[PDB]
Design an enzyme around this catalytic site. Sequence first.
Site, mmCIF file in Angstrom:
data_model
loop_
_atom_site.group_PDB
_atom_site.id
_atom_site.type_symbol
_atom_site.label_atom_id
_atom_site.label_comp_id
_atom_site.label_asym_id
_atom_site.label_seq_id
_atom_site.Cartn_x
_atom_site.Cartn_y
_atom_site.Cartn_z
ATOM 1 N N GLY A 190 26.618 -38.982 12.998
ATOM 2 C CA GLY A 190 26.051 -39.766 11.908
ATOM 3 C C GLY A 190 24.996 -39.045 11.073
ATOM 4 C CG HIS A 250 33.442 -36.078 6.801
ATOM 5 N ND1 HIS A 250 32.612 -34.986 6.564
ATOM 6 C CD2 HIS A 250 32.916 -36.810 7.814
ATOM 7 C CE1 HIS A 250 31.583 -35.134 7.382
ATOM 8 N NE2 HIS A 250 31.713 -36.226 8.142
ATOM 9 C CB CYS A 255 27.762 -36.025 7.849
ATOM 10 S SG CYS A 255 28.423 -34.763 8.948
HETATM 11 C C1 LIG Z 1 28.719 -35.594 10.415
HETATM 12 N N1 LIG Z 1 28.143 -36.734 10.573
HETATM 13 C C2 LIG Z 1 29.194 -34.798 11.601
HETATM 14 C C3 LIG Z 1 28.076 -33.895 12.105
HETATM 15 C C4 LIG Z 1 28.484 -33.220 13.409
HETATM 16 C C5 LIG Z 1 28.506 -34.205 14.595
HETATM 17 C C6 LIG Z 1 28.074 -33.362 15.787
HETATM 18 N N2 LIG Z 1 27.262 -32.320 15.222
HETATM 19 C C7 LIG Z 1 27.420 -32.224 13.837
HETATM 20 O O1 LIG Z 1 26.832 -31.463 13.083
HETATM 21 N N3 LIG Z 1 30.325 -34.012 11.124
HETATM 22 C C8 LIG Z 1 31.544 -34.094 11.765
HETATM 23 O O2 LIG Z 1 31.811 -34.836 12.699
HETATM 24 C C9 LIG Z 1 32.579 -33.161 11.208
HETATM 25 C C10 LIG Z 1 33.615 -33.880 10.396
HETATM 26 C C11 LIG Z 1 34.928 -33.700 11.071
HETATM 27 C C12 LIG Z 1 34.737 -32.945 12.338
HETATM 28 N N4 LIG Z 1 33.311 -32.578 12.358
HETATM 29 C C13 LIG Z 1 32.730 -31.593 13.150
HETATM 30 O O3 LIG Z 1 31.590 -31.178 12.966
HETATM 31 C C14 LIG Z 1 33.562 -31.029 14.277
HETATM 32 N N5 LIG Z 1 33.551 -29.598 14.019
HETATM 33 C C15 LIG Z 1 34.661 -28.969 13.505
HETATM 34 O O4 LIG Z 1 35.763 -29.477 13.410
HETATM 35 C C16 LIG Z 1 34.457 -27.546 13.089
HETATM 36 F F1 LIG Z 1 34.558 -26.703 14.143
HETATM 37 F F2 LIG Z 1 35.409 -27.160 12.195
HETATM 38 F F3 LIG Z 1 33.271 -27.295 12.491
HETATM 39 C C17 LIG Z 1 33.024 -31.410 15.645
HETATM 40 C C18 LIG Z 1 33.965 -30.818 16.675
HETATM 41 C C19 LIG Z 1 33.058 -32.916 15.791
HETATM 42 C C20 LIG Z 1 31.623 -30.918 15.949
HETATM 43 C C21 LIG Z 1 34.735 -33.147 9.667
HETATM 44 C C22 LIG Z 1 35.520 -33.834 8.609
HETATM 45 C C23 LIG Z 1 34.460 -31.704 9.444
#
Ligand SMILES: *C(=N)[C@H](C[C@@H]1CCNC1=O)NC(=O)[C@@H]1[C@@H]2[C@H](CN1C(=O)[C@@H](NC(=O)C(F)(F)F)C(C)(C)C)C2(C)C
Lengths: 302, 302
Positions: free
Chosen positions: A143, A41, A145
């Site tokens: 950030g 992603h 991830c």
């Molecule tokens: C990676 N850097 C982030 C880590 C997130 C940020 C907040 N806490 C975390 O662990 N990953 C993401 O932003 C991922 C990314 C899109 C959306 N996202 C999410 O974690 C979202 N969650 C979801 O959509 C769900 F419910 F399916 F897990 C969010 C609402 C922003 C927390 C992708 C591609 C999964």
Amino acid sequence: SGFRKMAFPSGKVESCMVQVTCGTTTLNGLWLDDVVYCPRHVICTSEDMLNPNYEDLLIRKSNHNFLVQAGNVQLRVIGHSMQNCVLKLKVDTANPKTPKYKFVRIQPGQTFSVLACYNGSPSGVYQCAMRPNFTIKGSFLNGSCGSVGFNIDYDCVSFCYMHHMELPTGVHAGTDLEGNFYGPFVDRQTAQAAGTDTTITVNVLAWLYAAVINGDRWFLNRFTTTLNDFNLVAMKYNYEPLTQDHVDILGPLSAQTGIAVLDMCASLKELLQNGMNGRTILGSALLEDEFTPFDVVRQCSG
Amino acid sequence: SGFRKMAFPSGKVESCMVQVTCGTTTLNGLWLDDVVYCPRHVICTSEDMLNPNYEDLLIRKSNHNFLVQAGNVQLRVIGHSMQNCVLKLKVDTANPKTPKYKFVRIQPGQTFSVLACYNGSPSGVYQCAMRPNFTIKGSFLNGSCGSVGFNIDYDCVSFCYMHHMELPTGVHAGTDLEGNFYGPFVDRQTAQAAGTDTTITVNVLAWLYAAVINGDRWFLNRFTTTLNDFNLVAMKYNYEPLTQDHVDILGPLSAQTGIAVLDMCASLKELLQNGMNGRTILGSALLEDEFTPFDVVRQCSG
Ligand SMILES: *C(=N)[C@H](C[C@@H]1CCNC1=O)NC(=O)[C@@H]1[C@@H]2[C@H](CN1C(=O)[C@@H](NC(=O)C(F)(F)F)C(C)(C)C)C2(C)C
Ligand SMILES: *C(=N)[C@H](C[C@@H]1CCNC1=O)NC(=O)[C@@H]1[C@@H]2[C@H](CN1C(=O)[C@@H](NC(=O)C(F)(F)F)C(C)(C)C)C2(C)C
């Protein structure tokens, strides 16, 4: 003496963390040999994440669209491929500090250390247990991830987790280093449910052995139970059934303390049926299930 | 989101751990520039520790009585001296991986990461708070002495603790890197009393802000209190009095959440007089005081 939740020393993994940027998205990558692994992603805009077609999105990216930085050194990207939910970027330089490593898929109930990173820079380390519902209770901000989970056996780093997302409940989800999610989750910003969770029975027993080793004995009783009787109680309190294999895994702790597994199971049954009633064990008002028998033995021996 | 007890990445400190042996006693040492710092009781046999005359014991040792190993390489000792409870061994080789560092004396209530070591080899990392009675709740077995506590600020490692002993209550005691004990303790195997402990009020407040930032709000309301009235309640529950300096330190968290410090104090005052009533805060049934305001800012915005 003393029992604390402890992470592995992170030095070997810190030397593999890099920053990966694609357009306006920046996250972390793991640099091993001449390959940098990161969540796919990284190629998405915030709009793309709602319903991404990863195959089409990646086709529009060339090697130059990916900027990989190790400290202040740009690593030239000379190839890119997607394996499940992981993007593999081949770089022109092998990491000279690549430790001996393996990529493993951990089982539910097992633990690992997470080296939380931002902008390719390690910020902290903590231990996680992979829940029976394939989620972890972490601490991840925007950030984070690409941060990885790992275990160390002397000199070999077994990477088992890469951070990808947080669920509506507040828990976290990710993949192994082959990009296969733990659990039924997908890398799409859409509400997703983690299953009903259960308590990791064998870990609770391992933590009760850690408690006895530390002088916390108030819960020890003169009774012994049977595996079948304990399992009748386990099902009522949403604890995983104890198996002979789990009883066998508790062997070393049972031997070190001279407390039989079924003597300890009678302590646990009494704690469940009567409740802890405000009392504490190893500083905790709750029965803890995030330590494996190996974590307890590792800490009680050196 | 998520809130976890997190240690600093340990890599920079792992590169400084060495093994120090003097006769039959082996412990850890910290190798910075051309000096190796270790607890002075490395010169003691088991009987000596009962009532040691360290000055007399050190007279009997020469540079060649100290075996220092960095990995599988012996570092030659060319000078030795005792500074308080720490032995300083000048070695013939400067540590080529000496990070930018400083030696600091931490205040009660502040936190630091401990890199637990055995035979000069790192085994695990965990966070500790220096209790108001100058003890820490760690995990240290035989041979753990010489393990150090530290904080990292970008590239600078501030060393604040070196492990020396465990007290009758299972708590741990040690010195700063100049060899001065934290607390009234001495490096002698004799029964020693740690004072009555107290709860670190400013840290509980910081953790309540971390809970709010993560979605817990049941303890919030429009009630408030003066700094003086909260202190009358705090004294009854063995909490440290809250000063205007502590209120000021909570300012950034207060601004981030929009909840004034005295408003959180009213919630805390309410939590002590009324209890939690079966509920939890950040996965805990007890109020936690081992997170400083800086620890919370680091995870809930940083
Ligand atoms: C990676 N850097 C982030 C880590 C997130 C940020 C907040 N806490 C975390 O662990 N990953 C993401 O932003 C991922 C990314 C899109 C959306 N996202 C999410 O974690 C979202 N969650 C979801 O959509 C769900 F419910 F399916 F897990 C969010 C609402 C922003 C927390 C992708 C591609 C999964
Ligand atoms: C150093 N490697 C050990 C670390 C100890 C071992 C068990 N848990 C630890 O943290 N330090 C010692 O063994 C020091 C050492 C003599 C005695 N000692 C103790 O920690 C003892 N405690 C005390 O006598 C007390 F209570 F005063 F702190 C012991 C009974 C072994 C736990 C010296 C020179 C202080």
